[PDB]
Curated annotation (Swiss-Prot), chain A:
This is Programmed cell death protein 1. It is found in: Cell membrane. Residues 3-105 form the Ig-like V-type domain. Inhibitory receptor on antigen activated T-cells that plays a critical role in induction and maintenance of immune tolerance to self. Delivers inhibitory signals upon binding to ligands CD274/PDCD1L1 and CD273/PDCD1LG2. Following T-cell receptor (TCR) engagement, PDCD1 associates with CD3-TCR in the immunological synapse and directly inhibits T-cell activation. Disulfide bonds join C22-C83. It is linked to Autoimmune disease with susceptibility to Mycobacterium tuberculosis: An autosomal recessive immunologic disorder characterized by lymphoproliferative autoimmunity and onset of various autoimmune diseases in early childhood. Death from autoimmune pneumonitis may occur. It comes from Homo sapiens (Human). Changing N42A: Decreased N-glycosylation without affecting binding to binding to nivolumab drug. Ubiquitinated via 'Lys-48'-linked polyubiquitin chains. Deubiquitinated and thus stabilized by USP5. N-glycosylation at Asn-26 contains at least two N-acetylglucosamine units and one fucose. N-glycosylation does not affect binding to nivolumab drug. Changing N76A: Decreased N-glycosylation without affecting binding to binding to nivolumab drug. The gene is PDCD1. Changing N26A: Decreased N-glycosylation without affecting binding to binding to nivolumab drug. The chain holds residues 33 to 146 of 288 of the full protein.
Swiss-Prot record, chain B:
Highly expressed in the heart, skeletal muscle, placenta and lung. Weakly expressed in the thymus, spleen, kidney and liver. Expressed on activated T- and B-cells, dendritic cells, keratinocytes and monocytes. Glycans are attached at N18. It comes from the Eukaryota. Disulfide bonds join C23-C97. It is linked to Truncation of the 3'-untranslated (3'-UTR) region of CD274 transcripts leads to elevated expression of CD274 in multiple cancers including T-cell leukemia, diffuse large B-cell lymphoma and stomach adenocarcinoma. Disruption of 3'-UTR region is caused by structural variants that stabilize CD274 transcripts, leading to overexpression. Increased expression in tumors promotes immune evasion and tumor cell growth by allowing malignant cells to escape destruction by the immune system. Belongs to the immunoglobulin superfamily. BTN/MOG family. Induction: Up-regulated on T- and B-cells, dendritic cells, keratinocytes and monocytes after LPS and IFNG activation. Up-regulated in B-cells activated by surface Ig cross-linking. Plays a critical role in induction and maintenance of immune tolerance to self. As a ligand for the inhibitory receptor PDCD1/PD-1, modulates the activation threshold of T-cells and limits T-cell effector response. Through a yet unknown activating receptor, may costimulate T-cell subsets that predominantly produce interleukin-10 (IL10). Can also act as a transcription coactivator: in response to hypoxia, translocates into the nucleus via its interaction with phosphorylated STAT3 and promotes transcription of GSDMC, leading to pyroptosis. The PDCD1-mediated inhibitory pathway is exploited by tumors to attenuate anti-tumor immunity and escape destruction by the immune system, thereby facilitating tumor survival. The interaction with PDCD1/PD-1 inhibits cytotoxic T lymphocytes (CTLs) effector function. The blockage of the PDCD1-mediated pathway results in the reversal of the exhausted T-cell phenotype and the normalization of the anti-tumor response, providing a rationale for cancer immunotherapy. It is found in: Cell membrane; Early endosome membrane; Recycling endosome membrane; Nucleus. Residues 2-110 form the Ig-like V-type domain. Ubiquitinated; STUB1 likely mediates polyubiquitination of PD-L1/CD274 triggering its degradation. Ubiquitinated by MARCHF8; leading to degradation. Deubiquitinated by USP22; leading to stabilization. Interacts with PDCD1. Interacts (via transmembrane domain) with CMTM4 and CMTM6. Interacts with (phosphorylated) STAT3; promoting nuclear translocation. Interacts with CD80. This is Programmed cell death 1 ligand 1.
Length: 106, 115
């Protein structure tokens, strides 16, 4: 039951804010939700978490949605992003959204 | 920030040998076991599920029961080291490690089996 991460493509002018939404409803006994950017290789580099910079994760009033927000977006922030729900109990599991791409222009 | 790291992303391993691949995680003074979870998987098969110092064999993909293990004496050093014996062609691919220990992260490792 993978999370969703939208919009799947997002163009913004540098200095503006950039807001994805990660939606994940899960019945997991113990879990965390992480925001990843892909490295210049395909390595998952953690940017932030719910719970636990300009990379801010915020649960919304309806509860199943979260804003992953890049504040005051730089140009070389441009790249690939995703949210990864990690269940810790009873069964450890990693669930990833499809990858979204962020373009920041001059 | 709890982050996991890998020494290298890609390992070349000889067919028919034993391999070890690793993910590193920060550890303070001593290891709190009860606060530690370690998971390895490959291609959605579950290899290691180590939860507070106990392998849960129930949830392990049964073809690894005997050939896979986490090096227990490396954990206090901040090293999650998965070791698989008798590496074959099928063991090539992308492995994922997740460690949870105030709180969580994961990484991917490519294994290339040279034969
Ligand atoms: Na050992």
């Amino acid at each position: 039951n993978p999370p969703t991460f939208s919009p799947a493509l997002l163009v913004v002018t540098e200095g503006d804010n950039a807001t994805f939404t990660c939606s994940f409803s899960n019945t997991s006994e113990s879990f965390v939700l992480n925001w990843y950017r892909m490295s210049p290789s395909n390595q998952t580099d953690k940017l932030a978490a719910f719970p636990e910079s300009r990379f801010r994760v915020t649960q919304l009033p309806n509860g199943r949605d979260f804003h992953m927000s890049v504040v005051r977006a730089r140009r070389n922030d441009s790249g690939t992003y995703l949210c990864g729900a990690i269940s810790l109990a009873p069964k450890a599991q990693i669930k990833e959204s499809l990858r979204a791409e962020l373009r920041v222009t001059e | 920030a709890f982050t996991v790291t890998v020494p290298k992303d890609l390992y070349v391993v000889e067919y028919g040998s034993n391999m070890t691949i690793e993910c590193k995680f920060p550890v303070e003074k001593q290891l709190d076991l009860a606060a530690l979870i370690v998971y390895w998987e490959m291609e959605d098969k579950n290899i290691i599920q180590f939860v507070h110092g106990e392998e849960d064999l129930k949830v392990q993909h049964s073809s690894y029961r005997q050939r896979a293990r986490l090096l227990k004496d490396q954990l206090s050093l901040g090293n999650a080291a998965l070791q698989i014996t008798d590496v074959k062609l099928q063991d090539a691919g992308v492995y994922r490690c997740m460690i949870s220990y105030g709180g969580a992260d994961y990484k991917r490792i490519t294994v290339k089996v040279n034969a």
